[PDB]
Amino acid sequence: AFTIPVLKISEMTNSRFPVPVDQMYTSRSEGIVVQPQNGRATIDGELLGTTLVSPVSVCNFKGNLQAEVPGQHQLYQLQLTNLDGSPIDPTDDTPGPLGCPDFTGLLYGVASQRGPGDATRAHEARIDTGSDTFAPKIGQVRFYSTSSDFETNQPTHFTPIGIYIEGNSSDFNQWQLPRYGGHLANNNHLAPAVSPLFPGEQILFFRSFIPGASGHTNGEMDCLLPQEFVQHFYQEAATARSEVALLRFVNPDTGRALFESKLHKQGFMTIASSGDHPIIMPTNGYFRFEAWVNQFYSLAPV
């Protein structure tokens, strides 16, 4: 049988950045192609894009510190491995390595090392996922740091923390996919763009405000499914008995329900709403699976 976990919004994890979900949010997404590559799974358990199941891995990188780049101080070259330690394989049926950021911007975090022996060191670092040299698909990623305290040829981890706003073209765009293969390459194996097809409906997003390290940004990061749903679908692999799972957002405090949403088989939710706005609800509220409906099932607004 098909099920979804009982979770308060505040208990959900963002599938595109390793922080909790802050609020439900809906938008028209006017003139935007919504094509995130993280937090993509079908309801019958097939992972898509660069989606992995670990809730703490998205936007992390691992690899060897190859060298400091010639000519540019405290810019360091990583030769990536996959997050699981295995070599990068550009022939994988993915756009890039699992967990790789699916947005362009200055990703701010910490690069740490262990080695030689148990000697360790860690410092702030930034990775520009929009730069020409950003090519995780073939394991080539550079990070900038304000420290020169990094050892060559030692295992290096990048732990993401937030976004750094310089105030120019490299600015955080959550819907702009990076060129996973680098400047000269076209993306492939992409999870498809999503949009609402039924009149009156909009996609329901799970939004987090990720930390900012500099500049002005609300750090808005919208995922299609909380990571817990991704994990659950993967784990259960339940048969999708129709194209749409009807879900109901219920308030355990009153015992009564607030709205319904359509969970599409391909892994995204829609609601009957119009306009760009937060969907604020009683904090103990959660979704419950009600029935198998089709893509023409008609929802009351809100």
Ligand X SMILES: CC(=O)N[C@@H]1[C@@H](O[C@@H]2O[C@@H](C)[C@@H](O)[C@@H](O)[C@@H]2O)[C@H](O[C@@H]2O[C@H](CO)[C@H](O)[C@H](O[C@]3(C(=O)O)C[C@H](O)[C@@H](NC(C)=O)[C@H]([C@H](O)[C@H](O)CO)O3)[C@H]2O)[C@@H](CO)O[C@@H]1O
Give yes or no for a contact between 111 and 123, defined as CB atoms under 8 angstroms apart.
yes
Neighbour tally for 160: CB within 10 Å: 23
Minimum distance from residue 178 beta carbon to ligand X (Å): 22
Give yes or no for a contact between 138 and 182, defined as CB atoms under 8 angstroms apart.
yes
Quick one: what does residue 85 bind among ligand X, a copy of itself, none, with the CB cut-off 5 to 8 Å set by partner type? a copy of itself
Nearer to a copy of itself, 42 or 159 (CB): 159
Quick one: what does residue 110 bind among a copy of itself, ligand X, none, with the CB cut-off 5 to 8 Å set by partner type? a copy of itself
- Residue 131 interacting with ligand X (CB under 6 A): no
- Residue 214 interacting with ligand X (CB under 6 A): yes
Q: Where on the chain is the footprint of a copy of itself (CB under 8 A)? A: 5-7, 10-11, 13, 18-20, 53-57, 83-85, 108-110, 112, 114, 117-124, 157, 159, 161-162, 165, 209, 211-219, 227-228, 231, 235
Minimum distance from residue 78 beta carbon to ligand X (Å): 18
Non-local (6+) Cβ contacts of 142 within 8 A are: 69, 75, 76, 77, 78, 127, 128, 131, 133, 134
Nearer to ligand X, 217 or 227 (CB): 217
Nearer to a copy of itself, 3 or 152 (CB): 3
Neighbour tally for 30: CB within 10 Å: 6
Size of the site for ligand X (CB under 6 A): 7
Nearer to ligand X, 44 or 124 (CB): 124
Report the alpha-carbon distance of residue 71 to residue 69 in Å, rounded: 6
Minimum distance from residue 218 beta carbon to a copy of itself (Å): 5
Nearer to a copy of itself, 114 or 248 (CB): 114
Minimum distance from residue 87 beta carbon to ligand X (Å): 26
Nearer to a copy of itself, 96 or 160 (CB): 160
SS3 138: helix
Q: 239: which DSSP letter?
A: -
Report the alpha-carbon distance of residue 265 to residue 138 in Å, rounded: 32
Q: 8: which DSSP letter?
A: -
Minimum distance from residue 150 beta carbon to ligand X (Å): 8
Question: What is the pattern of x (binds ligand X, CB under 6 A) and - over residues 148-187?
Answer: -x--------------------------------------
Minimum distance from residue 273 beta carbon to a copy of itself (Å): 24
Dihedral angle over CA of 33, 34, 36, 37, nearest 10: -60
Report the alpha-carbon distance of residue 188 to residue 205 in Å, rounded: 24
Q: Footprint of ligand X on residues 40-99 (CB under 6 A)?
A: none
Minimum distance from residue 198 beta carbon to a copy of itself (Å): 31
Q: 136: which DSSP letter?
A: G
Burial class (CB in 10 A: 0-12, 13-18, 19+), 264: buried
Nearer to a copy of itself, 67 or 237 (CB): 237
Report the alpha-carbon distance of residue 225 to residue 296 in Å, rounded: 21
Nearer to a copy of itself, 90 or 211 (CB): 211
> Could you tell me the two tokens for 247?
């879900």
> Could you tell me the two tokens for 286?
């959660």
Tell me which amino acid residue 164 is: Y
- Residues forming contacts to ligand X in the complex (CB under 6 A) are 119-121, 149, 214-216
